[PDB]
């Protein structure tokens, strides 16, 4: 359990889609509350862990941040092995992104076939769409959740997570809750805890708050 770090449960959510997309971008804002503004590919797969807080207490996703540039296949199929959930992501921006779709959501039903996916239109926030949600007809024909998404403006970026859980645990009526502070460490130590620090600060120090049409 605590090796999982399931406080009570844990759950395999797969994080899949084109590159450039935001998969990695969503899951350092939901970690660290940062917005990275930097691309830097993701290799193989990154596992973060990420808790909420529900009713029914606190949840554990353990996010499977896939690579993009991998070719649709067998190779991958270690990744969705056992996944519970899936989180499709495409950019609006990009047609050619969002064409890429029915292929993601095909590798990821070949191995775990039917759980809950949702599909997340990222980069909402950008006045020039060209894939209208309108449009989109895809989850339809799927039965998958659709969901607009900014990374940049927190526009319903809680959403999939919350929506995956309600499906998983059963409870429609599940809502989050913001979760009793714990009292932050006093940090004297230096081994373990030097290093990682640095990386922090300089994507801190980068980022600079993404008002792209904010104003609109």
Same mark, same amino acid.
């Given at each position: 359990?605590?090796?999982?770090? @399931?406080?009570?449960?844990?759950?395999?959510?797969?994080? #899949?889609?084109?590159?450039?997309?935001?998969?990695?971008?969503?899951?350092?804002?939901?970690?660290?509350?940062?917005?990275?503004?930097? /691309?830097?590919?993701?290799?193989?797969? @990154?596992?973060?862990?990420? #808790?909420?807080?529900?009713?029914?207490?606190?949840?554990?996703?353990?996010?499977?941040?896939?690579?993009?540039?991998?070719?649709?296949?067998?190779?991958? %199929?270690?990744? /969705?092995?056992?996944?519970?959930?899936?989180?499709?992501?495409?950019? $609006?921006? &990009?047609?050619?992104?969002?064409?890429? $779709?029915?292929?993601?959501?095909?590798?990821?039903?070949?191995?775990?076939?039917?759980?809950?996916?949702?599909?997340?239109?990222?980069?909402?926030?950008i006045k020039d769409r060209?894939?209208?949600?309108?449009?989109?007809?895809?989850?339809?024909?799927?039965?998958?959740?659709? /969901?607009?998404? &900014?990374?940049?403006?927190?526009?319903?970026? @809680?959403?999939?997570?919350?929506?995956?859980?309600?499906?998983?645990?059963? %409870?429609?009526?599940?809502?989050?809750?913001?979760?009793?502070?714990?009292?932050?460490?006093?940090?004297?130590?230096?081994?373990?805890?030097?290093?990682?620090? @640095?990386?922090?600060?300089?994507?801190?120090?980068?980022?600079?708050?993404?008002?792209?049409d %904010?104003?609109l």
């Open positions: 359990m605590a090796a999982q770090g @399931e406080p009570q449960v844990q759950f395999k959510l797969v994080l #899949v889609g084109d590159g450039g997309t935001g998969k990695t971008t969503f899951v350092k804002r939901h970690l660290t509350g940062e917005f990275e503004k930097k /691309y830097v590919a993701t290799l193989g797969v @990154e596992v973060h862990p990420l #808790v909420f807080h529900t009713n029914r207490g606190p949840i554990k996703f353990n996010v499977w941040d896939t690579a993009g540039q991998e070719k649709f296949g067998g190779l991958r %199929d270690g990744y /969705y092995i056992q996944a519970q959930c899936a989180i499709i992501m495409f950019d $609006v921006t &990009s047609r050619v992104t969002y064409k890429n $779709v029915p292929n993601w959501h095909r590798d990821l039903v070949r191995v775990c076939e039917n759980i809950p996916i949702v599909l997340c239109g990222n980069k909402v926030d060209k894939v209208k949600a309108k449009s989109i007809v895809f989850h339809r024909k799927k039965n998958l959740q659709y /969901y607009d998404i &900014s990374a940049k403006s927190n526009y319903n970026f @809680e959403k999939p997570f919350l929506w995956l859980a309600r499906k998983l645990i059963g %409870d429609p009526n599940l809502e989050f809750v913001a979760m009793p502070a714990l009292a932050p460490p006093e940090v004297v130590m230096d081994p373990a805890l030097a290093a990682q620090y @640095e990386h922090d600060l300089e994507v801190a120090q980068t980022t600079a708050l993404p008002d792209e %904010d104003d």
